[PDB]
Amino acid sequence: GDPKRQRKKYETPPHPWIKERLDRERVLMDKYELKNKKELWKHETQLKNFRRRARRLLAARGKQAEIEREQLLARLKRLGLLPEDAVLDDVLSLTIEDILERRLQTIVYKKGLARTMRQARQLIVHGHIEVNGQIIRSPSYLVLKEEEDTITYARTSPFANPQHPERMMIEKA
Amino acid sequence: MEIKITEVKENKLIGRKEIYFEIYHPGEPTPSRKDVKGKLVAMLDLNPETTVIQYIRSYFGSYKSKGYAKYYYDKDRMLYIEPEYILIRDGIIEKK
Amino acid sequence: ARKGPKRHLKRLAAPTSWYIERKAYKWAVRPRPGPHNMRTSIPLLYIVRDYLGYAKTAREARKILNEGKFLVDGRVRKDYKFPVGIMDVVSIPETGEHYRVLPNRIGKLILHPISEEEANIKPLRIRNKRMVKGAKIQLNFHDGTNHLIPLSEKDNYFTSYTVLMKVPEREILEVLPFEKGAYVFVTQGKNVARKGRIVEIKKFPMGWPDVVTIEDEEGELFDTLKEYAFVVGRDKPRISLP
RNA sequence: AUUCCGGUUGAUCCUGCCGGAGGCCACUGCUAUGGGGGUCCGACUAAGCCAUGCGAGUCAAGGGGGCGUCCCUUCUGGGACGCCACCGGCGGACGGCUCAGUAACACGUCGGUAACCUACCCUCGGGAGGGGGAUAACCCCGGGAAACUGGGGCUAAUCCCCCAUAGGCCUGGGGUACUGGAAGGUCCCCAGGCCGAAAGGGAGCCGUAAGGCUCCGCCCGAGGAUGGGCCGGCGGCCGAUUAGGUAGUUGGUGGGGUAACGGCCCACCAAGCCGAAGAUCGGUACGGGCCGUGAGAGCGGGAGCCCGGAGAUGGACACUGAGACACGGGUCCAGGCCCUACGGGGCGCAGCAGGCGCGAAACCUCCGCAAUGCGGGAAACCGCGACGGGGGGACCCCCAGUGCCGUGCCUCUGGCACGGCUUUUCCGGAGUGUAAAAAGCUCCGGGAAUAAGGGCUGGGCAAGGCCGGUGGCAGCCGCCGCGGUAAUACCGGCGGCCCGAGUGGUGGCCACUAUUAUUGGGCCUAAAGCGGCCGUAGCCGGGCCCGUAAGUCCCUGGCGAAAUCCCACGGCUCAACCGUGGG
Ligand SMILES: [Mg+2]
Ligand SMILES: [Mg+2]
Ligand SMILES: [Mg+2]
Ligand SMILES: [Mg+2]
Ligand SMILES: [Mg+2]
Ligand SMILES: [Mg+2]
Ligand SMILES: [Mg+2]
Ligand SMILES: [Mg+2]
Ligand SMILES: [Mg+2]
Ligand SMILES: [Mg+2]
Ligand SMILES: [Mg+2]
Ligand SMILES: [Mg+2]
Ligand SMILES: [Mg+2]
Ligand SMILES: [Mg+2]
Ligand SMILES: [Mg+2]
Ligand SMILES: [Mg+2]
Ligand SMILES: [Mg+2]
Ligand SMILES: [Mg+2]
Ligand SMILES: [Mg+2]
Ligand SMILES: [Mg+2]
Ligand SMILES: [Mg+2]
Ligand SMILES: [Mg+2]
Ligand SMILES: [Mg+2]
Ligand SMILES: [Mg+2]
Ligand SMILES: [Mg+2]
Ligand SMILES: [Mg+2]
Ligand SMILES: [Mg+2]
Ligand SMILES: [Mg+2]
Ligand SMILES: [Mg+2]
Ligand SMILES: [Mg+2]
Ligand SMILES: [Mg+2]
Ligand SMILES: [Mg+2]
Incomplete structure (x- = not known):
């Protein structure tokens, strides 16, 4: 036979030029300041996979199905996508916007460390943001709920000084 | 730099002690082998002639480094057990 | 094997009962013939290097073995290829510790700490039994070893019984029937x-x-x-x- | 996403095929800043031919010698020390490479050997007595163009050969101790034969010596282990414009041969054996784990990693050995090729690099035994193009860049002007990293500086009814269709759309396709019911009662290697990747 080949983590659209899909995706790309379509498609795929696991677990029974059922719920609430008292049916009401709100870029903008989404992306890439004492330079990293509030400027960054000129302009917003 | 000792283990079969440690140093370069050895021998009361540093490793976005060192009770046992390259790289002996 | 015995073993084809990282290297130690079989034992190098951690590399594990620091069933073992199997006792006298080799709930080999007193005995299941010249009885055990008994004792031993043996003297002290x-x-x-x-x-x-x-x-x-x-x-x- | 859209008419509804839209693989146009991870790169044509270097050694604690530095005395020597080759031992049957042959017990899977071999390793029970012999090295003399190779002298062993004992094998007669489901097996006692062991060797101390005390060793027997041989049931391609095939063929009796059962091979006696449920013959092809695609049912493939098989230019055949009819060992024939002083003598990279040829189609004549392992050694160690490390390459996958902020002006998407900020990436340094280097990672100085393309623009199908050329010419066109001097469709400018370090062209498989239909299609008029009927095998078969338990359903033992797939947790900054558990 054939040895393993590493496969793409995202899926492409079945037709490249459908007007309604193009409009919807353009709105999302503008709002969250993503770099290209594949990035967006990556997140879409993540969502699909979650739903596909819930659809299979609803129609299953036995002992391993229960363990998998509780593991899916536990992982979803660890990422912060569901509240602590959610049930399996709630998996089927998740939207693409729920996942994008968990990007480190979005969360850095939401907390008020930057003035714009674009500035948040540059702050992440240049190495000015620390997450639980560690510097991470990937704007697409999905932030867990347990570490969301320990997100600050890096202690060696120029921005870790309340008198820095660019930080004062960020604070004025 | 600030050094923290994580584990000290006794290996009687080889005749040495094995020491794992961390170094905290925000805003500074990776510490040199000589400085680490001096600080370690002061911190543990070791004969520096039989103290070998296995490695010092830094990580991607961290302010600390992890390190591993070994201390022999006898010089001849050290020369018999350790490879030549590590003793040269640590300045214990001279490369021919 | 086109023309002769195999002498090598790839990591990916190693036995499933060993605790070994299967993708870290190309080769594994091909165990030497000996007491147990391939499915119920492991080479001694993985005990010294991988399990206990007394050595980091194969070269210094061999120096430890050659000085005579490890005992298996009460006898000095220097071969790094020596197979160590079910119910054996691994002894380190310079550190004063002893273990019994036993399978896991998942079928993997592990070391169970024991007392110094219990380290003197090894249980041996009787695998086969036969008549031998001079009309004596030979007992063949599960670990491949053998013992002799006189014809008058022939009714006190049968296959699937267990014999508790004092090692390394190899003296019987108890028979446990099935x-x-x-x-x-x-x-x-x-x-x-x-x-x-x-x-x-x-x-x-x-x-x-x-x-x-x-x-x-x-x-x-x-x-x-x-x-x-x-x-x-x-x-x-x-x-x-x- | 369990999906449709364009094309037969002046207009309509059908059948039906072609085209568009998706994924993956191989070649290829134009164009390219950074890093990380991986099982990627002369497989398709030529299992074609190969210059040069390398890809298998190791032991001085088995044995006599050569030579050197030193110590005691030395006329002479004895010691110790360190290199050299030779005799001797073990390995060289593994590992590495390729897929030509093969439709077969080759492979997968469950069983069998009471029909068998096994050096190295483990346990237990025993043994090591007496004799003999040559020869390499070394010295004399040489031959031959070379590859090679001759005579004489002398010498040792864990080298070789004998004698004894132990032991082994065959057959005949008794006894019943063992294992097993079951004894042509094991064990005991008589009897006739044949074959027939061993190195008390080596090293170090206590020894005044005598002799111990350790370590490494030698031979036989019983069992195991390891590596194999042989056998059976079951499972997996295409062709009838191949229908009959086989004659050691199928079985029996008596032998031989083999490690071993067997028409495996002989002598003799019979007529068997396979076949329309497809023999035989022909075609194509290494088998599996797996891989591509699809909602699934399915359809297609099986180079790369692991396990099994086969081969070393083609066809035959032997020696040594535990193991071979042996890729870097031997013989013959055939076919190429190299060196010859012409008498002769040699060589096949389907090992790693490298060259030529073939083609649409594939890299450096580099560094290391530090890691993982293998062989050798009592050990420290030594060797290894396995393996590890880098060099070249739009191989696959994961994560980033080609600036950011404020205030003004414009055609307000975005471009320009001011003011400020940052340094992923870039340039120069220190440390860490590494067998040594390089990358990577932590810090310091400089500075928005060093970084965007390819295709498309009439419909399908997102995007112009603008301008300049050409004028059924040139050209475009997957399909439908454009172009005949007022072209939204050709060429070019300016605009616009899609994707983006990529984006287009060509060929293949799946999907599209319910155009292969078990799930699930059709046959009055569109492709399609034999002109009609009788009947053999096969498939399909009426109601009730009793039995069985093959099919069928439920529970539980032994199996279906690892890698690959799904889930949670943990380690590399997260991920890709890797580990621990569940499936
Ligand atoms: Mg294959
Ligand atoms: Mg018509
Ligand atoms: Mg079609
Ligand atoms: Mg070729
Ligand atoms: Mg050979
Ligand atoms: Mg071979
Ligand atoms: Mg054929
Ligand atoms: Mg078979
Ligand atoms: Mg068959
Ligand atoms: Mg049986
Ligand atoms: Mg004899
Ligand atoms: Mg016979
Ligand atoms: Mg072929
Ligand atoms: Mg095939
Ligand atoms: Mg290949
Ligand atoms: Mg060839
Ligand atoms: Mg290529
Ligand atoms: Mg090449
Ligand atoms: Mg050895
Ligand atoms: Mg349109
Ligand atoms: Mg075209
Ligand atoms: Mg015009
Ligand atoms: Mg144009
Ligand atoms: Mg039809
Ligand atoms: Mg009719
Ligand atoms: Mg009829
Ligand atoms: Mg009926
Ligand atoms: Mg049944
Ligand atoms: Mg498996
Ligand atoms: Mg981490
Ligand atoms: Mg993770
Ligand atoms: Mg894994």
Whole structure:
């Protein structure tokens, strides 16, 4: 036979030029300041996979199905996508916007460390943001709920000084 | 730099002690082998002639480094057990 | 093997009972012929280097072995290819520790700490039994070793009994029969590492192996092959088991 | 996403095929800043031919010698020390490479050997007595163009050969101790034969010596282990414009041969054996784990990693050995090729690099035994193009860049002007990293500086009814269709759309396709019911009662290697990747 080949983590659209899909995706790309379509498609795929696991677990029974059922719920609430008292049916009401709100870029903008989404992306890439004492330079990293509030400027960054000129302009917003 | 000792283990079969440690140093370069050895021998009361540093490793976005060192009770046992390259790289002996 | 014996072993094809990282390197140690079989033992180098951690590289593990620091069943072993198997005792006298080699609930080999006193005895299941020249009896054990008994004793030993032996002197001190009410420890199969008492024994025609029903502590009955059931006591264990 | 859209008419509804839209693989146009991870790169044509270097050694604690530095005395020597080759031992049957042959017990899977071999390793029970012999090295003399190779002298062993004992094998007669489901097996006692062991060797101390005390060793027997041989049931391609095939063929009796059962091979006696449920013959092809695609049912493939098989230019055949009819060992024939002083003598990279040829189609004549392992050694160690490390390459996958902020002006998407900020990436340094280097990672100085393309623009199908050329010419066109001097469709400018370090062209498989239909299609008029009927095998078969338990359903033992797939947790900054558990 054939040895393993590493496969793409995202899926492409079945037709490249459908007007309604193009409009919807353009709105999302503008709002969250993503770099290209594949990035967006990556997140879409993540969502699909979650739903596909819930659809299979609803129609299953036995002992391993229960363990998998509780593991899916536990992982979803660890990422912060569901509240602590959610049930399996709630998996089927998740939207693409729920996942994008968990990007480190979005969360850095939401907390008020930057003035714009674009500035948040540059702050992440240049190495000015620390997450639980560690510097991470990937704007697409999905932030867990347990570490969301320990997100600050890096202690060696120029921005870790309340008198820095660019930080004062960020604070004025 | 600030050094923290994580584990000290006794290996009687080889005749040495094995020491794992961390170094905290925000805003500074990776510490040199000589400085680490001096600080370690002061911190543990070791004969520096039989103290070998296995490695010092830094990580991607961290302010600390992890390190591993070994201390022999006898010089001849050290020369018999350790490879030549590590003793040269640590300045214990001279490369021919 | 086109023309001769194989002398190499790839990591990916290593036995499933070893604790070994299968993708870290290309090659594994091909064990030397010896006491146990391939499915129930492991080379001594992985005990010194990988399990205990007394050495970092193969070269300094070999120097430790050549100086005579490790004992297996009371005897000095220097070969890094030597197979160490089920029910053996691994002894380190310079550190004063002793272990018994036993399978896991998943079928993997592990080291169980024991007392210094219990380290003197090894249980041996009787695998086969035969007549030998001079009209004496030879007993062939599960670890491949052998013992001789006089013809007058022929009714005190049968296949599947266990003999507790003092090592390294190799002196018999107790015979444990295979019968109902005996205490057994499972060594292979789906129910590996479970233990209990014997309830019933069943046989079949044309050479199909015989099966045993066993009651555990919590009161559940399960079956296994008779040759997978290793007698360890009368109604209580005579060795320490997890 | 369990999906449709364009094309037969002046207009309509059908059948039906072609085209568009998706994924993956191989070649290829134009164009390219950074890093990380991986099982990627002369497989398709030529299992074609190969210059040069390398890909298998190791032991001085088995044995006599050569030579050197030193110590005691030395006329002479004895010691110790360190290199050299030779005799001797073990390995060289593994590992590495390729897929030509093969439709077969080759492979997968469950069983069998009471019909068998096994050096190295483990346990237990025993043994090591007496004799003999040559020869390499070394010295004399040489031959031959060379590859090679001759005579004489002398010498040792864990080298070789004998004698004894132990032991082994065959057959005949008794006894019943063992294992097993079952004894042509094991064990005991008589009897006739044949074959027939061993190195008390080596090293170090206590020894005044005598002799111990360790370590490494030698031979036989019983069992195991390891590596194999042989056998059976079951499972997996295409063709009837191949219908009959086989004659050691099928079985029996008596032998031989083999490690071993067997028409495996002989002598003799019979007529068997396979076949329309597809023999035989022909075609194509290494088998599996797996891989591509699809909602699934399915359809297609099986180079790369693991396990099994086969081969070393083609066809035959032997020696040594535990193991071979042996890729870097031997013989013959055939076919190429190299060196010859012409008498002769040699060589096949389907090992790693490298060259030529073939083609649409594939890299450096580099560094290391530090890691993982293998062989040798009592050990420290030594060797290894296995393996590890880098060099070249739009191989696959994961994560980033080609600036950011404020205030003004414009055609307000975005471009320009001011003011400020940052340094992923870039340039120069220190440390860490590494066998040594390089990358990577932590810090310091400089500075928005060093970084965007490809295709498309009439419909399908997102995007112009603008301008300049050409004028059924040139050209475009997957399909439908454009172009005949006022072209939204050709060429070019300016605009616009899609994707983006990529984006287009060509060929293949799946999907599209319910155009292969078990799930699930059709046959009055569109492709399609034999002109009609009788009947053999096969398939399909009426109601009730009793039995069985093959099919069928439920529970539980032994199996279906690892890698690959799904889930949670943990380690590399997260991920890709890797580990621990569940499936
Ligand atoms: Mg294959
Ligand atoms: Mg049997
Ligand atoms: Mg018509
Ligand atoms: Mg079509
Ligand atoms: Mg070729
Ligand atoms: Mg050879
Ligand atoms: Mg070979
Ligand atoms: Mg054929
Ligand atoms: Mg078979
Ligand atoms: Mg067949
Ligand atoms: Mg004799
Ligand atoms: Mg016969
Ligand atoms: Mg072929
Ligand atoms: Mg095939
Ligand atoms: Mg290949
Ligand atoms: Mg060739
Ligand atoms: Mg190529
Ligand atoms: Mg090449
Ligand atoms: Mg050895
Ligand atoms: Mg349109
Ligand atoms: Mg075209
Ligand atoms: Mg015009
Ligand atoms: Mg144009
Ligand atoms: Mg139809
Ligand atoms: Mg009709
Ligand atoms: Mg009829
Ligand atoms: Mg009926
Ligand atoms: Mg049944
Ligand atoms: Mg598996
Ligand atoms: Mg981490
Ligand atoms: Mg993770
Ligand atoms: Mg893994």
